[PDB]
Amino acid sequence: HDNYADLSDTELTTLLRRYNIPHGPVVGSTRRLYEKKIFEYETQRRR
């Protein structure tokens, strides 16, 4: 439901890679933590 929540696991993984952000397995249990990490980085580029 969150903008980043509509991204699929495969698309989320390629996004972290573009920003060179270390990550492990993506699962609904830790998917949210990953969505927040991309938001914090993308926020910087927006500022």
With beta carbons less than 8 A apart as the criterion, state whether 47 and 16 touch: no
Tokens of 14: 């390629």
Residue with tokens 């509509």: 6
Residues 6+ apart with CB under 8 A from 5: 31, 35
DSSP code per residue over the chain: --GGGGS-HHHHHHHHHHTT-------HHHHHHHHHHHHHHHHHHH-
Domain 1-47 adopts which CATH fold? 1.10.720
CB atoms within 10 A of CB 16: 16
- End-to-end, the C-alpha distance of the chain in Å comes to 25
d(CA 41, CA 17): 12
From 29, 9, 47, select the one nearest 39 (Cα to Cα). 47
